[PDB]
Design a protein around this ligand. Structure first.
Ligand SMILES: *[C@@H]1O[C@H](CO)[C@@H](O[C@@H]2O[C@H](CO)[C@@H](O)[C@H](O)[C@H]2NC(C)=O)[C@H](O)[C@H]1NC(C)=O
Ligand SMILES: *[C@@H]1O[C@H](CO)[C@@H](O)[C@H](O)[C@H]1NC(C)=O
Ligand SMILES: *[C@@H]1O[C@H](CO)[C@@H](O)[C@H](O)[C@H]1NC(C)=O
Ligand SMILES: *[C@@H]1O[C@H](CO)[C@@H](O)[C@H](O)[C@H]1NC(C)=O
Ligand SMILES: *[C@@H]1O[C@H](CO)[C@@H](O)[C@H](O)[C@H]1NC(C)=O
Lengths: 50, 238, 29, 300, 50
């Protein structure tokens, strides 16, 4: 449940939902917001697996 | 006629447009704290029917209002900073057949046996008008008036009552209207032709949803160590 | 006489402790 | 080697897209704001509310080529694909030298004295040279700027009231040596250079709060198809799933539903007010059962 | 406006640099060579691109 809950976190991004980031922003900005989310989700998976 | 009443745990409302079912949701919003001081204002307020006096109360980051007035003495609310024609203000008047919400540089003119008259003969530079169904129309007629990010959000609930001043049960208010008024509204005044006024504070509440989309119970996480524990565990049973 | 052919105690143990990803449909199976 | 190995995952793909918006035919008054015959000053900026309309932004490109069209929270290209809560148009005439200062987080005389954007800002700052309309040899009466403000403005604060600023150490009532006069209106001549030349700026303030209202761009809707894996856009909410008839008892108030883990699991149809459940499309892992390459190339 | 990721009339109608760009943008004032009182025939700009 914690691992799923981490998906709603923004991790500094404008939005927690990738569809909204891609829907509103051009690729060069979306990549920044997406990378912030990738970092947060990847850290959440490493914590879960450990 | 102001008596503090410290017993109330009322004023919970649906914080958002999201439907929830069989969950406990922990949320932070402006709520009336449980067991907070709610000033009780007292037929026709502080004056008798012939007399006039209106406290012109502060609006401290949102106001909880209630009044079980079967005579419909209360007709509306005035929000603004002066209310003397110099600034923009929001007037909400329930005329039994409709409700008229207006924004203008309204001037208070002692606006109210069983005599009735018009109000606000001065109404310059009007910028906003909205109409809707009766807000008030034996019923407690609970309301929450909140102003944030420009929007003036009004929530309400009608809870029939006969033998008590307040029902013994729990209720949550549903939004009634949400208007983009853009008025600072530091203070407010009651429009009278048994009133309870409380103030909202930023707080975190644990809200219990039923199988249907309704709030049936709530915990004020800052009231007592037990409520705090309940919020920490996100359970109503510890 | 019972389906699963468990002993009375095993049936009690299984009843006391509480395939389709209806929950947590976020890549977690 | 002989065994079962997990390789790729499988997903059922959508077959069609569903686009649903309320049937609003009223167009947003962008030409009344941009093409107005008279504009408010930068100090007294005009805040026009745009709502209950179709936010078709092609009309701005029809209006004029622009010197600036800087969107901070959105891409200019994608405005026609979004829905907004409460679009606000802040319209004013400013000096060219301060046009670049109309941005989130900036410090300077215009940001501090007349008009500030919040540091957390979603919207677009649109500006163009306006010499062809308001440049006069006698000088107009439209310019009105705060020369010196008593304190910094908050985002979207408009200090309309005019008061004398105390420059000295004592109260002053119209006496030059101690009173600083708070306004700098000026008439403009067509012969002044670009930094002095007026620019007309319109700021479109957007709040993308999961579309509780409409103000949606010019998208054509399709029919609603249920019991299939589809892509969908429900009043700006974008996703993929299977839509079914809902048994949830929504109050007239709620528009969208969420699960215990805050993912979306229900929507209100923007045209029919039908409540639909969103079931994710079938997905799972794929395992390959191999007898071993040196035995047989058959797999399951 | 001649830079990766920019939006405007020149970026959209005549010349665009990729968002992922390695290179140098070199520019200088050229009035000394091509400024004429009669006017040259070298300027050619897209007014509006489809
Ligand atoms: C939720 O709403 C329903 C109505 O939508 C309430 O009414 C009962 O709903 C159940 C659903 O299985 C029916 O079997 C009952 O017959 C309904 N009641 C009556 C009097 O007809 C229900 O009570 C509400 N609350 C809960 C907790 O489900
Ligand atoms: C507190 O509430 C109860 C009903 O829940 C009521 O009977 C009681 O009078 C209230 N307290 C006071 C001091 O009025
Ligand atoms: C569109 O038309 C249908 C006709 O039945 C109506 O139900 C619907 O409410 C309309 N759309 C909006 C914006 O309400
Ligand atoms: C906008 O201004 C131009 C100026 O030539 C005028 O022709 C046009 O009708 C105006 N449009 C609106 C909508 O006011
Ligand atoms: C300001 O906006 C209002 C919106 O109703 C409009 O009527 C008015 O003409 C505008 N004024 C200027 C000077 O642009």
């Amino acid at each position: 449940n914690t691992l799923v809950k981490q998906l709603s976190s923004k991790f500094g991004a404008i939005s927690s939902v990738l569809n909204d980031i891609l829907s509103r922003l051009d690729p060069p900005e979306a990549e920044v917001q997406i990378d912030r989310l990738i970092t947060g989700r990847l850290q959440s998976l490493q914590t879960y697996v450990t | 006629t102001t008596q503090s009443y410290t017993n109330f745990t009322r004023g919970v409302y649906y914080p958002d447009k999201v439907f929830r079912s069989s969950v406990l949701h922990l949320t932070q919003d402006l709520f009336l704290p449980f067991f907070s001081n709610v000033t009780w204002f007292a037929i026709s307020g502080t004056n008798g029917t012939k007399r006039f006096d209106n406290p012109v109360l502060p609006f401290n980051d949102g106001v909880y209002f209630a009044s079980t007035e079967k005579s419909n003495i209360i007709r509306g609310w005035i929000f603004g900073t002066t209310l003397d024609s110099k600034t923009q203000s929001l007037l909400i008047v329930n005329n039994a057949t409709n409700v008229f919400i207006k924004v203008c540089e309204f001037q208070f003119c002692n606006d109210p046996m069983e005599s009735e008259s018009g109000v606000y003969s001065s109404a310059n530079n009007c910028t906003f008008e909205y109409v809707s169904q009766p807000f008030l129309m034996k019923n407690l007629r609970e309301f929450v008036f909140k102003n944030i990010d420009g929007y003036f959000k009004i929530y309400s609930k009608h809870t029939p009552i006969i033998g008590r001043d307040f029902p013994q049960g729990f209720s949550a208010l549903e939004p009634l209207v949400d208007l983009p008024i853009g008025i600072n509204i530091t203070r407010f005044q009651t429009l009278l032709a048994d009133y309870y006024v409380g103030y909202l504070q930023p707080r975190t509440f644990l809200l219990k949803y039923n199988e249907n989309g309704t709030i049936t119970d709530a915990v004020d996480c800052a009231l007592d160590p037990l409520s705090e524990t309940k919020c920490t565990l996100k359970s109503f049973t510890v | 006489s019972k389906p699963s052919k468990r002993s009375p105690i095993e049936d009690l143990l299984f009843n006391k402790v509480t395939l389709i990803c209806a929950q947590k449909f976020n890549g977690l199976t | 080697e002989k065994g079962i190995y997990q390789t790729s995952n499988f997903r059922v793909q959508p077959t069609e897209s569903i686009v649903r918006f309320p049937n609003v035919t009223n167009l947003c008054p962008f030409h009344e704001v941009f093409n107005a015959t008279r504009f408010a000053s930068v100090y007294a900026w005009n805040r026009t509310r745009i709502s209950n309309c179709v936010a078709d932004y092609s009309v701005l490109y029809n209006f004029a080529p622009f010197f600036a069209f800087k969107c901070y929270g959105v891409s200019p290209t994608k405005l026609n694909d979004l829905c907004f809560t409460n679009v606000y148009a802040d319209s004013f005439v400013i000096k060219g030298n301060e046009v670049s200062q109309i941005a989130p987080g900036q410090t300077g005389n215009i940001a501090d004295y007349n008009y500030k954007l919040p540091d957390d800002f979603t919207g677009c700052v649109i500006a163009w040279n306006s010499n062809k309309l308001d440049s006069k040899h006698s000088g107009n009466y439209d310019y009105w700027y705060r020369s010196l403000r008593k304190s910094k403005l908050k985002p979207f604060e408009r200090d309309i009231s005019t008061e004398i600023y105390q420059a000295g150490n004592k109260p002053c009532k119209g006496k030059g040596p101690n009173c600083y006069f708070p306004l700098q209106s000026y008439g403009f001549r067509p012969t002044y250079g670009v930094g002095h030349q007026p620019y007309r700026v319109v700021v479109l303030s957007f709040e993308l709060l999961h579309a509780p209202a409409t103000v949606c761009g010019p998208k054509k809707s399709t029919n609603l198809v249920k019991n299939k894996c589809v892509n969908f856009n429900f009043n700006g909410l974008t996703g993929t799933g299977v839509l079914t008839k809902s048994n949830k008892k929504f109050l007239p108030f709620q528009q969208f539903g969420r699960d215990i883990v805050d993912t979306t699991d229900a929507v209100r149809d923007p045209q029919t007010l039908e409540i639909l459940d969103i079931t994710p499309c079938s997905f799972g892992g794929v395992s390959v059962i191999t007898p071993g390459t040196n035995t047989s190339n058959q797999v399951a």
